[PDB]
Design a protein around this nucleic acid. Sequence first.
RNA 1: GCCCCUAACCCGGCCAUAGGCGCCGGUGCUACACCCGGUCUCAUCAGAACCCGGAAGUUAAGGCCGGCGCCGCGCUCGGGAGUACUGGGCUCCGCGAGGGCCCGGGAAACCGGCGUGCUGGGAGGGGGC
Length: 178
Amino acid sequence: MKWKELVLVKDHPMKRVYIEKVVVNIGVGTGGERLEKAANLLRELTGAEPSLRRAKRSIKDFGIRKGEPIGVAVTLRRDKAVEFLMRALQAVGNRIKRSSFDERGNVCFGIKEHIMLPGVKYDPAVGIWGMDVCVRLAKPGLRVQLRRRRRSKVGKGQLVTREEAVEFFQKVLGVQVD
RNA sequence: GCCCCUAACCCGGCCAUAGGCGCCGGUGCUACACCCGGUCUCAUCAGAACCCGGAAGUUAAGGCCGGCGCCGCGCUCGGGAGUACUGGGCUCCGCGAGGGCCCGGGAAACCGGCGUGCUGGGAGGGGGC
């Protein structure tokens, strides 16, 4: 069960749905060492290099200034995305709320503690963290919106719907959607 | 070479009649695409993008063309209207602020009507020299 054949296929070859990407986010308050622990935890958990996310706006109630890094997120595609997606679904319990699916092929779920993931051991030097995991599904032709030259809008029939995303998650990933 | 005719492609001009929303179609040899990969040039958290190498698949989408409705927009169109306003003259009216007459110019909102890109150069294709 790999990425290239994790596709949901309709009666047209060009309307195949697939996992465009999986993004894992840890949002921590400010800490230098706390953020380094979060970044290392994301690196070990996903196998990919995390990217530090700087605060967009200074909010003094949270004690964060604009430009300082308070997030650690990693974008996973193809094989690493599928492997971590299976691990994270096992951690959550193979269950996703139907109301968690937005109307455009995006589904995000939270992992409260990362020890629930398979293959992870409690460490006192790292503590216990949570994550947001967001899966973005797509059809072929999405590059028309993202390319540099002649960028245009993708037509409505070629965009992933909420019903198609829920059907993909049930029939292809074998997750229980309620 | 050179002349003529001509889709989608490339470089433009004016920059909505060109935009927005929704619905119905056409187009696929070639061209434009979606597309397939990441050895190399190059690139990032991420070959998503950019960059490179391709050609299995598809016109589903983009692009281009045709039709309809709405919003917006445009017009040297009819009305509004010779109206509002106004250049010059006056021993002309009014207590007065002001208004009037003559000569010369003359809108706008809005209503209805119509329209909904036009066009320059090149490639490619066809017909002659």
